[PDB]
């Protein structure tokens, strides 16, 4: 990898626009609510605040273009948080080689106290596994959470 191309930009642009049907360019708690409502579920507004606000750098609730693409790629209420993701990978792993294996996921989870089968993890890997080698690298992790 020694050259960038605008394919990434266009992809992220559309993925945002999908949720922001309004046009103004914010993913607020009302925006979240309306989507679930149309389908056929009625959320509790308190939870809609929290689930955003953990990550949101401002802690304002109105998640613009850059603040959404933060929540997708960078993540956490920090600045250049690609490093914080690279660090999160190393906690989860017992090596850290720009990847996260299915076994490593089972370990770090079950460590708390959760005897659950691996296949349930694997379903939500090969929902959107680009590389196809039973792991989850940086690009695959983001793109799976930002599926377009």
């Amino acid at each position: 990898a020694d050259q960038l191309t605008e394919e990434q930009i266009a992809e992220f642009k559309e993925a945002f626009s999908l949720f922001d049907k309004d046009g103004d360019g914010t993913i607020t708690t009302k925006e979240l609510g309306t989507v679930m409502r149309s389908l056929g579920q009625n959320p509790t507004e308190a939870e809609l605040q929290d689930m955003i606000n953990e990550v949101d750098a401002d802690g304002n609730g109105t998640i613009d273009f850059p603040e959404f693409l933060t929540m997708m790629a960078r993540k956490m209420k920090d600045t250049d948080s690609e490093e914080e993701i690279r660090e999160a990978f190393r906690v989860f792993d017992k090596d850290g080689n720009g990847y996260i294996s299915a076994a490593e996921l089972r370990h770090v989870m079950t460590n708390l106290g959760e005897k659950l089968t691996d296949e349930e993890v694997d379903e939500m890997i090969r929902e959107a596994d680009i590389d196809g080698d039973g792991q989850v690298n940086y690009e695959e992790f983001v793109q799976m959470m930002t599926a377009k």
């Binding site: 999908l18 979240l32 989507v35 959320p43 509790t44 939870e47 809609l48 929290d50 689930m51 929902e127 959107a128 799976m144 959470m145 930002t146 599926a147 377009k148």
Partner: peptide
């Protein structure tokens, strides 16, 4: 009887998961 995953649905279910983790802890 799922034929193929739709990209939009994966995001929405992953957003439903965000709601779930908070709900489970804060259940008082």
């Amino acid at each position: 009887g799922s034929h193929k995953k739709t990209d939009s649905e994966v995001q929405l279910e992953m957003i439903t998961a965000w709601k779930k983790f908070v709900e489970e802890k804060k259940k008082k």
